[PDB]
Amino acid sequence: MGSSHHHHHHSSGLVPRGSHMGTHTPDQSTAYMQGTAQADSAFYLQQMQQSSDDTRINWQLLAIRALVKEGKTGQAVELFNQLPQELNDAQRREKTLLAVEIKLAQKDFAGAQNLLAKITPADLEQNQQARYWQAKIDASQGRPSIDLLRALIAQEPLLGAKEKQQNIDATWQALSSMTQEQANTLVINADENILQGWLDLQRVWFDNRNDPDMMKAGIADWQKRYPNNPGAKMLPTQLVNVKAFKPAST
């Protein structure tokens, strides 16, 4: 026989990622982060183990995200363990997004906001805001506090006028449950448009629900004050509950 290339041969030749992959922006990996591409945690997981260092985590941005949507939290956690604690400033956010949807399944809702607090939406992707926000609202389960309004308002630009009704409602789901004083003690954003604005409406609501002539008018009042506010273009049902309210003399 001739000598071709016969040497040690443990396996066919599995080449592991000894590289961290250069910093080039993804094509699919972010598509699923956009909602422009669809796949399972399984895919995000399937590539993760096959991918390079920062790409493992990069794929896990999706993987964990998806996994805890699926409901599997500790499954999301175990590979959450896999992603870095200390990324770049924006990439930090990208994994911390996951931490939230994890906590949300852990009923660590407080811890979820805790992570949401580390993240900056004005920093991440517009859509990764919404991904982040949907984890925020979830942490604000109807928890009468600003971070609810802060959150669904926050996704309002990201979403639709069809999701707005939702936003509008979940926002009001703070205002109607939140207190004037709470509302008055809240912490608003940088935009500081919609958030405190929303409250003005509950301010009138807190007094006016069962006082129709001023409630609906107070509604139509606030909406003038903050037309900018999603609610001022379409108003929630709980203030609308003046319509829906008791007998109104006419």
Distance between CA 129 and CA 151 in Å, rounded? 9
Contacts of 207-214 spanning 24+ positions with Cβ under 8 A? 208/242, 209/238, 209/239, 209/241, 209/242, 209/245, 210/245, 210/246, 211/242, 212/242, 212/243, 212/245, 212/248, 213/248
Q: Do 228 and 197 form a contact (C-beta atoms < 8 A)?
A: yes
CATH 1.25.40.650 residue ranges of the chain are: 142-250
Query: Where do the CATH 1.25.40.10 domains begin and end in the chain?
Result: 17-141
CB 168 within 8 A of CB 229: no
Pull the structure tokens for residue 24: 């080039």
Phi, psi of 127 (to 5 degrees): -80, -40
| Residue 65: Cβ within 10 Å count | 25
CATH code linked to domain 142-250: 1.25.40.650
**Elucidation technique:** NMR
Nearest partner of 124 among 91, 157, 80, 84, judged by Cα: 91
Q: Residue 188 phi/psi, 5° resolution?
A: -90, 175
User: Angle at CA 75, nearest 5°, toward 72 and 77?
Assistant: 110
Candidates 1.25.40.10, 2.60.40.3880, 3.40.50.80, 3.40.50.300; correct CATH number of 17-141? 1.25.40.10
Assigned token pair, 3: 């000598």
Task: In whole angstroms, give the CA distance from residue 51 to residue 46.
Answer: 9
For 42, the token pair is 């399984």
Tokens encoding 222: 């606030």
Quickly list H helices, the chain. 31-34, 41-48, 53-70, 74-80, 89-103, 109-116, 126-133, 136-139, 146-155, 161-175, 180-183, 194-208, 212-225
How much is the CA Rg of the chain, to the nearest whole Å? Answer: 24
How does DSSP assign 201-237, residue by residue? Answer: HHHHHHHHTT-HHHHHHHHHHHHHH-TTSGGGTS--T
- Non-local (6+) Cβ contacts of 41 within 8 A are 62, 63, 64, 65, 66, 67, 70, 72, 76
